[PDB]
Design a binder for these strands. Structure first.
Length: 95
RNA sequence: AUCAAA
């Protein structure tokens, strides 16, 4: 299954545990007008899962970020930037 | 390793 949840949504893996949404809007907002930002975190420490997501208003403002910020760093920790895929903690059922 | 949303 090759799935990509529409242009403009990025996957931001390898982030610091100290990074949050404000740093993620502030850093990816440098490439395009953000419409949404995600930052994934532990449910007992509310830190970070070490990866996040962001939605741009243009599918190519996200390309310009995913062509600049990819392989760089956030809060001192090296990251990946790419078009986002769908989650994998859940699967189809019944039928 | 810079690997995916509870």
């Amino acid at each position: 299954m090759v799935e990509a949840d529409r242009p403009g949504k990025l996957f931001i893996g390898g982030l610091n545990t100290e990074t949050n949404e404000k740093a993620l809007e502030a850093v990816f907002g440098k490439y395009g007008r953000i419409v949404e930002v995600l930052l994934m975190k532990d449910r007992e420490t509310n830190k970070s899962r070490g990866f996040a997501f962001v939605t741009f208003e243009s599918p190519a403002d996200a390309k310009d970020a995913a062509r600049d910020m990819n392989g760089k760093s956030l809060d001192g920790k090296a990251i990946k930037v790419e078009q986002a895929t769908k989650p994998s903690f859940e699967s189809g059922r019944r039928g």
